[PDB]
């Protein structure tokens, strides 16, 4: 009845940068920060107007390379100066076939893009 707000809403894989308060004023704002390796999409800052919050942001997942899936598809991580066992969203992972195997002639390039936890793995088949 005076423009005040409850706590800001929680988000997966991120938190607010400030001390959590029971109550915020009209025109208050809080900024959010994504956990290390997550990528913030949307408005870093939300504001308390007319007793409700502007829409929070989203923390976009990195892709964690799966030994299980690579095994099933006869591939491995390509050896590059930089490629670790994860990728940030938007970063491209390069794969190579197992010794003995060549790219499946229905398959995705060996280079493929991390997108919010999701990675299309290529397939190789025996020569």
């Amino acid at each position: 009845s005076t423009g005040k707000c409850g706590p800001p809403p929680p988000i997966d894989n991120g938190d607010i940068t400030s001390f959590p308060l029971s109550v915020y004023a009209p025109a208050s704002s809080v900024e959010y920060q994504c956990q290390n390796l997550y990528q913030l999409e949307g408005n870093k800052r939300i504001t308390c107007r007319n007793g409700q919050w502007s829409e929070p942001p989203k923390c976009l997942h990195p892709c964690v390379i799966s030994r299980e899936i690579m095994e099933n598809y006869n591939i491995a991580l390509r050896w590059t100066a930089k490629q670790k066992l994860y990728s940030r969203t938007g970063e491209s992972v390069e794969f190579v076939c197992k010794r003995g195997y060549r790219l499946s002639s229905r398959s995705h390039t060996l280079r493929t893009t991390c997108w919010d936890g999701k990675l299309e793995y290529p397939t190789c088949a025996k020569r």
Partner: nanobody
Amino acid sequence: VQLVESGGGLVQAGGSLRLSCAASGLTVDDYAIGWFRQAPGKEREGVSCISSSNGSTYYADSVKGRFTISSDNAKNTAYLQMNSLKPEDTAVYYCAAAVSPNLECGTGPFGIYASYYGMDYWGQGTQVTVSS
């Protein structure tokens, strides 16, 4: 790109053997050449590595001191000199190359996470047998 192993075979324990790897078809002159080995039923083991650019090398703890790696770039070849051979060195030995720039020997398929990494190209493999 093609990789031919040679120089394997049978030897007596405490014997020596010089594996040779002949790389034809390479485009790049910044690359890494590796030797891996595998005995039937065990996981592949990265044995040694040499970068043509930064001269970094690597040896698995199981072969440090005993094995020495070199490349004669004129004949486009790498050598693994294997001394003081033991029965546990018995395995198929694969030559392999990786063509991404600035590779640091001991990373990737030579590190603790080797299971996660592969190589750009592979030899057919050559059998090495050390009798007791």
